[PDB]
């Protein structure tokens, strides 16, 4: 159970003075690596998805991580999530667009995400039946507030999340040897999704 | 539409 399982150094990372806006931009959304329907704003700190019907649209972070601890806060208003809002990571090979509404992040071998609307985990996931996260809720869905932390531990090869400062356990394992970028996939017209890189 | 998109 939960925080007993945090990556090494996570408390320290979070307690330190946060990266300045320069560091946040360098690790933020990549205008050169996002859906053609997404506009990156403030040099990486957030993106806005154009109101294009029958489209799911993703973005990757500018920086891919293969070693060490990496955590960033995602801020995504609850009224701007729509039918499919997924938060996680992707390799460089994961698709960033499809032409219908779907859980695009985690629907293939190149991406891993949490459906913050339904509480399910998607990796290589096509049909119904994806697992619930976090565990230990007796099957009860945990609602995800506006802000959540995404925590990638490339020393252990895990991805996990935190709400309200509380780490919810590893969601995915077996990530070592890969180069992984912050990622989301979104369907809501004019949604604004913010990324705040915290280290390391 | 359902996702605040213009059809």
Instruction: Return the ∠ at Cα A111 (arms to A183 and A143), rounded to 5°.
Output: 65
Rounded CA separation A133/B4 (Å): 27
Measured in degrees and rounded to the nearest 5, phi and psi for residue A175 equal -90, -10
Q: How far apart are CA A45 and CA A59, in angstroms?
A: 12
What would the two tokens of residue A67 be?
A: 């070693």
CA A55 to chain centre: 19
CA distance B6 to chain A (A): 6
Residues A67 and A115: their CA atoms lie apart, in Å, by 25
Taking residue A122's Cβ as centre, other Cβ atoms within 10 Å add up to: 25
Cβ contacts of residue A80 below 8 Å, gap of 6+? Answer: A188, A190, A191, A192, A193, B4
Separation CA A102–CA A108 (nearest Å)? 12
Name the minimum distance, in Å, from the CA of A86 to any CA of chain B.
Answer: 14
Check if the beta carbon of residue A64 is closer than 8 Å to that of residue A180. Answer: yes
Distance CA A99, CA A93 (A): 18
CB contact under 8 A, A188 and B3: yes
CA A157 to chain CA centroid, nearest Å: 16
Question: Per-residue b/e over A179-193, b at no fewer than 16 CB within 10 Å?
Answer: ebbbbbbbbbbebbb
Smallest Cα–Cα separation from A109: which of A43, A28, A180?
A180
Q: Strands of chain A (E only): list them.
A: 29-34, 38-41, 46-49, 56-61, 69-75, 86-90, 97-98, 111-115, 120-122, 147-153, 158-163, 166-172, 181-186, 192-199
Check if the beta carbon of residue A196 is closer than 8 Å to that of residue A75: yes
Q: What part of B 1-7 touches A (C-beta under 8 Å)?
A: 1-7
**With the CA atoms of A57, A55, A84 and A178 taken in that order, what torsion angle do they form, in degrees rounded to the nearest 10?**
-30
* Residue A129: partners with Cβ closer than 8 Å, 6 or more residues away: none
Query: Which secondary structure element, helix H or strand E, spans residue A196, and what is its range?
Result: strand A192-199
Backbone CA torsion sign across A121, A122, A123, A128: positive
State the sign of the Cα–Cα–Cα–Cα dihedral A114, A30, A24, A192: negative
The tokens for A20 are: 């300045």
Q: What is the resolution of this structure in A?
A: 1.8
Which residue has tokens 């077996």? A174
Give the nearest chain A residue to B2 (CA atoms). A82
Secondary-structure breakdown of chain A: helix, strand, coil percentages, each rounded to the nearest 5: 10, 40, 50
Q: Round to whole Å and give the CA distance between A173 and A152.
A: 10
b/e for A125-163, b at 16 or more Cβ within 10 A? beeeebeebbeeeeeeeeebeeebbbbbbbeebbbbbbb
Q: By the 8 A CB rule, do A71 and A153 touch?
A: no
Could you tell me how many residues make up chain B?
Answer: 7
**A80, A188, A189 ranked by CB distance to B6: nearest:** A189
State the Cα–Cα distance between residues A31 and A145, nearest whole angstrom. Answer: 26
Residues of B in contact with A82 (CB under 8 A): 2-4
CB A72, CB A113: distance < 8 Å: no
Test A189 with B7 for CB contact under 8 angstroms: no
Centroid of chain to Cα A95: 15
Q: Which of A134, A85, A88 is nearest to A113 (CA)?
A: A88
């Amino acid at each position: 159970l939960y925080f007993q399982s945090m990556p090494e150094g996570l408390e320290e990372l979070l307690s330190a003075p946060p990266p300045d806006l320069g560091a946040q931009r360098r690790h933020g959304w990549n205008p050169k690596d996002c859906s053609e329907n997404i506009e990156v704003k403030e040099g990486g700190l957030y993106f806005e998805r154009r109101p294009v019907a029958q489209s799911t649209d993703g973005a990757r972070g500018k920086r891919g991580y293969s070693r060490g601890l990496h955590a960033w806060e995602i801020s995504w208003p609850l009224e701007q999530r729509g039918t499919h809002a997924v938060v996680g990571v992707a390799t460089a090979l994961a698709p960033l667009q499809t032409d219908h509404y779907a859980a695009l992040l985690g629907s293939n071998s190149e991406s891993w995400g949490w459906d913050i609307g339904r509480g399910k985990l998607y990796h290589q996931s096509k049909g119904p039946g994806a697992p619930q996260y976090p565990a230990g809720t007796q099957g009860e869905q945990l609602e995800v507030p506006e802000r959540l932390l995404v925590v990638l531990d490339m020393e252990e090869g895990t991805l996990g999340y935190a709400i309200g400062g509380t780490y919810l356990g590893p969601a995915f394992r077996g990530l070592k040897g890969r180069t992984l970028y912050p990622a989301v996939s979104a369907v809501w017209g004019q949604c604004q999704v913010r990324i705040r890189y915290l280290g390391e | 539409d359902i996702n605040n998109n213009n059809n």
